[PDB]
Design a binder for this molecule. Structure first.
Ligand SMILES: O=C(O)c1cc(C(F)(F)F)ccc1N[C@@H]1CCc2[nH]c3ccccc3c2C1
Ligand SMILES: O=C(O)c1cc(C(F)(F)F)ccc1N[C@@H]1CCc2[nH]c3ccccc3c2C1
Length: 281
């Protein structure tokens, strides 16, 4: 809108870096393309957690929904790329994982799922903080509106109609692995290639490890049966505390997969700290 100056595209819709003409505040403006939707979204303006981006305004006008967010200068994807020749230091990996779990524990405690966690638009600042952003909430609310599948939980790929909070733990597990190894864990190019990449690493799931998998909507008895690989190939040289946590985040059965609250108690975080990243802006 004419309410904002210096509108600069930076990435459901387009996201711009903008300056509020009145206040001089620099913000992130998402342009998308419902009474319940407006009220549900607006409830989130009043919720507050250090590891979730602040939602400042909601605006339904024209055929458009604008969401105005606090502005952070970089995301985890850019930082991962910048750090690819050296790797992110393990204390900083650990701090970011811990903070992202704190943010998820909070939104799951309010019965909200992110649904589209990925390194992109996980927002970071110079103070060491990381924040959940770019939620996949339009569909879950009454909002009428190429896809990266690398972080999608297997129950989503198998057509489950009712996601649980466990889908976000899966995605975060994939991000954790990618921070450690500097390569995407499951880089699929289609829904079935995504599924089969998971199966080739973690083994084709069956009723022993995932009760009910063979009744999922898109499950096919014709799926190839791959044996589970050596887990020590997956995230070398991560230590056994880290590998243990990761394996619990990547359990096939959503009922067995670790919760955010329980993950925070895992021994991996006993020595957690909050280091300062080296950011070039
Ligand atoms: O800051 C926010 O709130 C924000 C919100 C969302 C969403 F709306 F999707 F939630 C998406 C991205 C957001 N920020 C960008 C993160 C990554 C990045 N890289 C840059 C490189 C040059 C200049 C600016 C940038 C930015 C800013
Ligand atoms: O991130 C987006 O793009 C986004 C999009 C939509 C829409 F439905 F409109 F598409 C709605 C919300 C969105 N994000 C919120 C940012 C602030 C915040 N605080 C919370 C506190 C507890 C639980 C969840 C939250 C959220 C999520």
């Amino acid at each position: 809108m004419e309410n904002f100056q210096k509108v600069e595209k930076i990435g459901y819709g387009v996201v711009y870096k903008a300056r509020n003409k009145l206040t001089g505040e620099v913000v992130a403006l998402k342009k998308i393309r419902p009474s319940t939707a407006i009220r549900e979204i607006s409830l989130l303006k009043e919720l507050n957690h250090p590891n979730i981006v602040k939602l400042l305004d909601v605006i339904h006008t024209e055929n458009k929904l604008y969401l105005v967010f606090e502005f952070l200068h970089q995301d985890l994807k850019k930082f991962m790329d910048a750090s690819a020749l050296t790797g992110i230091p393990l204390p900083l990996i650990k701090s970011y994982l811990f903070q992202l779990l704190q943010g998820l524990a909070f939104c799951h405690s309010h019965r909200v799922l992110h649904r589209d966690l990925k390194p992109q638009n996980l927002l970071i600042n110079t103070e060491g903080a990381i924040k959940l952003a770019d939620f996949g909430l339009a569909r879950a609310f009454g909002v009428p509106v190429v896809v990266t599948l690398w972080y999608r939980a297997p129950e989503i790929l198998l057509g489950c109609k009712y996601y649980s909070t466990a889908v976000d733990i899966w995605s975060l597990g994939c991000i954790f692995a990618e921070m450690v190894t500097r390569r995407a864990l499951f880089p699929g190019d289609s829904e079935i290639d995504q599924l089969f990449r998971i199966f080739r690493t973690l083994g084709t799931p069956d009723e022993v490890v995932w009760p009910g998998v063979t009744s999922m909507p898109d499950y096919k008895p014709s799926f190839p049966k791959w044996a589970r690989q050596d887990f020590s190939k997956v995230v070398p040289p991560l230590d056994e505390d880290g590998r243990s946590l990761l394996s619990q985040m990547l359990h096939y059965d959503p009922n067995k997969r670790i919760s955010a609250k329980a993950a925070l108690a895992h021994p991996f975080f006993q020595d957690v700290t909050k280091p300062v990243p080296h950011l070039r802006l």
